[PDB]
Design a binder for this molecule. Structure first.
Ligand SMILES: N[C@@H]1CCCc2c(O)cccc21
Length: 165
């Protein structure tokens, strides 16, 4: 199971880890991807997860988009987890660098409540431009299921833990 996590609340855990390496190790039922509405996994967490699947995630995603159209900001879809997990929950947090509504971050985290346990990154953090301290706060105040957060950056992980209220 998940090891080396710091417990933040009854259901939220956090670790300084590369979510790709964490997924390859744990092979959780659900790994969350920091997706965009087009499921174009170019960079950040999405680029890294997709590269770990040898682009199989992108091939599956393009078929999903061809059939269903784009996701909504704040929405999600469940696809295969490939070699990383049973499933990948592609969740679209608002991208403040694209001028999207930060208020949709709570709606994005609500998708996690449909899964009893998840390995996840902080939504809208990194290249999505939101404040990761705010993302962690929204996560702990929204998600009720068991979420294991992987924070790639050690300095950000330390800042998140040391400032956690
Ligand atoms: N590797 C096991 C397979 C069974 C499901 C599961 C999970 O939900 C979370 C963490 C690890 C695992």
């Amino acid at each position: 199971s998940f090891s080396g996590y710091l417990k933040l609340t009854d259901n939220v855990y956090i670790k300084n880890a590369d979510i790709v390496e964490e997924a390859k190790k744990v092979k959780p039922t659900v790994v969350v991807n920091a997706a965009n509405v087009y499921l174009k996994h170019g960079g950040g967490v999405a680029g890294a997860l997709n590269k770990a699947t040898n682009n199989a995630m992108q091939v599956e995603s393009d078929d999903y988009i061809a059939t269903n159209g784009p996701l909504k900001v704040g929405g999600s879809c469940v696809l295969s987890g490939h070699n990383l997990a049973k499933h990948c929950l592609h969740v679209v947090g608002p991208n403040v660098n694209k001028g999207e509504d930060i208020q949709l971050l709570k709606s994005a985290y609500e998708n996690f409540n449909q899964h009893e346990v998840l390995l996840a990154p902080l939504l809208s953090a990194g290249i999505f431009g939101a404040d990761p301290i705010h993302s962690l706060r929204v996560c702990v105040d929204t998600v009720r299921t068991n979420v294991y957060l992987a924070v790639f950056d050690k300095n950000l992980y330390d800042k998140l833990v040391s400032s956690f209220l």
